Ligand binder design. Structure first.
Ligand SMILES: Nc1nc2c(ncn2[C@H]2C[C@H](O)[C@@H](COP(=O)(O)OP(=O)(O)OP(=O)(O)O)O2)c(=O)[nH]1
Ligand SMILES: Nc1nc2c(ncn2[C@H]2C[C@H](O)[C@@H](COP(=O)(O)OP(=O)(O)OP(=O)(O)O)O2)c(=O)[nH]1
Ligand SMILES: Nc1ncnc2c1ncn2[C@@H]1O[C@H](COP(=O)(O)OP(=O)(O)O)[C@@H](O)[C@H]1O
Ligand SMILES: Nc1ncnc2c1ncn2[C@@H]1O[C@H](COP(=O)(O)OP(=O)(O)O)[C@@H](O)[C@H]1O
Ligand SMILES: [Mg+2]
Ligand SMILES: [Mg+2]
Lengths: 608, 624
């Protein structure tokens, strides 16, 4: 089925009252008195498509005597996809698209748009016109660099970004400082300054410290349980997942050292892991960040290095790199018991172009960020509504069927996104750093593990094409989609529905479940939070309409690995554990985690 | 006496075991390994004398024929006054002089010093060779400038500096932020980030925050350290005239609180405002008052440049990015048979002004705007220590018009020969680049302080008129707390009276740790009957004063007064006396008895409004 006919199925389904409240509440623009310039999703969709279509102004393939036709065609596609909610960019794009721009240019009908109007949009874009979710800055080992990083955190946070850092450059507590006053206070003491700064600016960050840092134990307890309430903390792992699994299995030792220090120490790699698991068992933090696995697949490694992710895990980024995200609602792609792959590939093509185009109309607070993005052009195309899609296809999330379905779905998406990048590379220019990347300097480089689809062969050959042309260094990610999935009235990222009914009722359950059976049980379901131990609901309804805590921790982890084989950046997935999980259940998640292809790990025990 | 014979009375006198603990603790240079490179105060004096003498390379009055001789001579004279402990520069000069310089060069016998050695000292001073105690930085009304300022605080703090800011440019809480419809959080909110930063930079081994009385968040500020900005000293700033403010108070007027970049305005009764301050000061000692209006009155560069804040302890009003290096002369050592040896003292002022102006040439700052500002103005802070101990020798009670009159004359004398040295130096080396646009030039009869308490005024005016032509420095004098350097010199701090005449500081001799070492004022030891000292001694340590002790001569009770024997107004009036003859400001705590009320604090504030004081710090005996 053609995308245009898909769009027509969705373009006029009104956003729920839930979605509409969140929109009014924070997406609809407001004039200098707090009066509405936008009153429905259509206004947002028009504004956003028009701002992003403006980037086509820079397309060397067009000419004068063609640009305006071509530009308006892109705004029109962008607009229809957006209004239909089949693809939605990350929040910062929705908020900040068109800031600076004369109101009478942002909502004026497309037919009336002139080449001058598009140019004025382009140039009236102000310093707040920042449209990317994800940032990473370094924190060098000097008071100067620490405080410049604190400044950068403030500026990024002001304009709407989430920011992450690896703090491992900072010498541990006690090290010599060539001076007078004595000793380094260490990474963790400095993260408290970042926390204070952000707590003020925000009246949601990531901080990583590597496993072999002498202050790792202090760091692991850092949010126990002084505090760093604005940080998500992850333990970094710069070395092979292989080496770390093996060292653990052999009950090895890890040498804690730092180059700019004489602080050395030895700890049993298993005691450290138990320390992590115990804390995570209690409160969720710290997560794990398989930095070395990220770099394995990093087309620009080792002449660039991923040391951190963004606050939620899904983009591992090099220094001063940012990435703009967007998500395709796959639940809208259901048709007759099948995923309409005809329409999907067309959207994937449109979506990659939109995301590449956001780069050109984005404004960042820091020149080093502007330049890092220009050279790499990293994108984060993902999916939402996956769980809801599986409900429609009558596939239980915790099953091998579901994961083989995921892997193939993600493989398909990966294929056409990367083919779209080759084609944009042709049309617009390669990403400046193509020459020094492994897409070029290597043969048969692929930036994810694969090994769970029949598209591998095809993917392995699109990857050879991108030797000559490639617009972007990587293109895929699965994001949390906390807000935009709510806008799209769909499930979040790859996650299972956390609940089917929550007065604080899933639409697919409402259709597939016989009403009155639905009316009877809906009170009991709200309390018990699962269909599992509601008696007299059909075994097939019970099996398919699984919630997060119906799905055991390995089924969560194996879903993540399935998607991650076909994702070139990383994945936001929470490994939900039942309240009765033990610290030993967490270690087991961690070990399975080191054997699968996942690039990181977040666990969360119900009740903790 | 000539200074040479005074140096002789003092040069082979070693610091007390007390001072030696301080030196070992924080002043003696250790090496990359943690081994001592210095073990005697004399090693410090050597290193510091040699480094500041190095600034003589730049002296454009010296033919290369004479340079090594001229430099070695200043090195020796600097070495002599420092070893004797007659003058001591602020602590960072002592901690950081010679950082970056090869160790062979810093202590080696002088007679082995070649002109290349001096050049080598000069070239190798590293990024940590920061020799100034006092700094002011602006904090502009934007996120980027707020956070550039936090970065400046951390970098100044790291190298030894004390830093202050006026936060009044930040727009009040809840105010409008362009293009967000999100609201500004306010100055106090960001002061917490500055505090957090510094609590971490100083983790293990100080700051001034000022908000102006008319800021719409002033009441919040006044309470900011109520039961916290534990790393800040807070003052309320008055950029208007003290007259306006005194008058407004007497009329029981209202004050308008408004901000240039906000719609938020409010009207508050000044009396009610002052009482809020007084109560909080009465409770905790914060906030102080900062009469910036009154500093700008005497600032040679105003309105071209403006003073908006002081450093941590208040004794230096500084324009944006300005720093100031301080040093203090021990006046107790200049006692010669019931008189102050003015002859020896004048030579030491000549020497100490030159030393402090040499610090500026060997000084490295972490920030370019600071270097520039400092090179433009060349503000010095020469002060005194051991003044209370000097009064003891002269048998003068601190709390008397006699003490105040002597203090004004002393200061007036010092100020005279200090500015006359700046004259000489300006001829010899060049004028401070901004002499031309300063009030020393664009006016007749500009004096950078009030005067009115000395025979010396007429002559001071002579000298100030002279410096329309030749002037090395924009201002030259301060009185500092001297918290550390007065302990090194074994003498009383700044202009402050002795807090106690006798106490204990337990030995911590380890190796069977115990021993209470009982201190008694060295001048009390010399003028009180060892037979009396014998018996009263233990009542003195329980009661903290001599006053209500049976059988101590009435004239020793009157002379050996402590800080709490001296009433608030006599604290205040002494401050006034010095400030009449100081172009920077004055560090002075107005000590108050536990029994003092908030009305008593209020009256100190009204009285300071009538005197020439440039700001007020009060402390109530048992508050904190
Ligand atoms: N808490 C605290 N940390 C400091 C202080 N000074 C330096 N550090 C820490 C910050 C960095 O983690 C590390 C290096 O600091 P810097 O590069 O600023 O020190 P510097 O270049 O003077 O000595 P270095 O050559 O790096 O050993 O030591 C300080 O005063 N306080
Ligand atoms: N807490 C907090 N304060 C802010 C924020 N943004 C601005 N402010 C305060 C900081 C300064 O006191 C004042 C002005 O900030 P900026 O100059 O960075 O804001 P901007 O230039 O975007 O708007 P403006 O032209 O100044 O209204 O507002 C914020 O995002 N969080
Ligand atoms: N409150 C926040 N402040 C700053 N950045 C955020 C915030 N919430 C999310 N982000 C950024 O966006 C990323 C993913 O967002 P989700 O997928 O959470 O986005 P959305 O808000 O578009 O539904 C996070 O990993 C983080 O980088
Ligand atoms: N702990 C400190 N940290 C940073 N600066 C300080 C500190 N203590 C004092 N200062 C600075 O030193 C100046 C002089 O203080 P004092 O006169 O107390 O210094 P010192 O006796 O060590 O030479 C003060 O006005 C202040 O600017
Ligand atoms: Mg360094
Ligand atoms: Mg601004």
């Amino acid at each position: 089925m053609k995308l245009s006919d898909l769009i027509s199925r969705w373009i006029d389904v009104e956003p729920s009252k839930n979605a509409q409240i969140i929109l009014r509440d924070r997406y609809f623009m407001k004039d200098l008195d707090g009066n509405y310039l936008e009153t429905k999703w259509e206004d947002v969709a028009r504004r956003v498509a028009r701002v992003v279509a403006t980037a086509e102004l820079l397309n060397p393939s067009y000419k004068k005597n063609e640009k305006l036709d071509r530009i308006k065609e892109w705004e029109d596609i962008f607009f229809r996809v957006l209004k239909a909610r089949l693809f939605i960019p990350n929040s910062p794009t929705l908020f900040n698209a068109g800031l600076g721009v004369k109101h009478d240019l942002l909502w004026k009908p497309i037919d009336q748009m002139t080449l001058e109007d598009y140019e004025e949009i382009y140039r009236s874009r102000n310093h707040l016109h920042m449209l990317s979710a994800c940032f990473v800055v370094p924190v060098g080992d000097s008071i100067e660099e620490i405080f410049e990083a604190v400044k950068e955190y403030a500026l990024i946070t002001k304009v709407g970004g989430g920011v992450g850092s690896n703090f491992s450059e900072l010498r541990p507590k006690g090290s010599f400082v060539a001076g007078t006053h004595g000793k380094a206070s260490g990474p963790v003491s400095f993260m408290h300054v970042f926390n204070s700064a952000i707590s003020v600016v925000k009246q949601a960050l990531m901080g990583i410290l590597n496993i072999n840092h002498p202050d790792i134990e202090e760091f692991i307890d850092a949010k126990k349980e002084a505090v760093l309430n604005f940080f998500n903390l992850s333990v970094g792992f710069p070395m092979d997942k292989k080496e770390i699994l093996k060292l653990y299995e052999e009950d090895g030792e890890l040498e804690l050292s730092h180059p700019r220090s004489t602080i050395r120490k030895k700890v049993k790699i298993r005691e450290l892991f138990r320390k992590i698991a115990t804390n995570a068992w209690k409160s969720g933090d710290p997560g794990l960040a398989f930095l070395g696995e990220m770099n394995k697949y990093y087309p620009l490694y080792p002449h660039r290095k991923i040391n951190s992710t963004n606050p939620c895990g899904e983009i591992g980024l090099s220094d001063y790199e940012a990435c703009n995200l967007g998500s395709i609602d796959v639940a809208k792609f259901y048709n007759n018991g099948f995923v309409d792959l005809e329409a999907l590939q067309e959207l994937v093509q449109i979506a990659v172009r939109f995301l590449d185009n956001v780069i050109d109309v984005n404004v960042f607070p820091i020149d080093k960020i502007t330049k890092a993005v220009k050279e790499s052009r990293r994108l984060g195309l993902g999916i939402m509504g996956f769980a809801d899609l599986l409900y429609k296809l009558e596939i239980p999330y915790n099953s091998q069927e579901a994961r083989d379905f995921a892997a193939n779905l993600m493989a398909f998406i990966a294929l056409h996104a990367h083919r779209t990048s080759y084609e944009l590379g042709k049309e617009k220019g390669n990403f400046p750093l193509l020459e020094i990347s492994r897409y070029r300097t290597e043969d048969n480089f692929v930036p994810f593990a694969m090994g769970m689809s029949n598209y591998d062969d095809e993917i392995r050959e699109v990857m050879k094409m991108t030797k000559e042309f490639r617009r972007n260094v990587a293109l895929l990610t699965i994001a949390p989609t906390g807000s935009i999935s709510n806008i799209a009235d769909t499930s979040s990222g790859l996650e299972p529905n956390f609940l089917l009914a929550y007065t604080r009722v899933n639409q697919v359950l409402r259709e597939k479940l016989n009403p009155e059976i639905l009316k009877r049980i809906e009170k009991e379901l709200i309390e018990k939070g699962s269909l599992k131990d509601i008696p007299d609901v059909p075994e097939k309804i019970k099996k398919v309409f699984v919630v997060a805590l119906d799905i055991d921790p390995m089924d969560h982890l194996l879903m993540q690995d399935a998607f991650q084989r076909y994702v070139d950046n990383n994945i936001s997935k929470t490994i939900n554990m039942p309240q009765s999980a033990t610290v030993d259940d967490v270690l087991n998640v961690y070990l399975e985690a080191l054997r699968t292809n996942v690039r990181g790990i977040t666990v969360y025990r119900d009740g903790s």
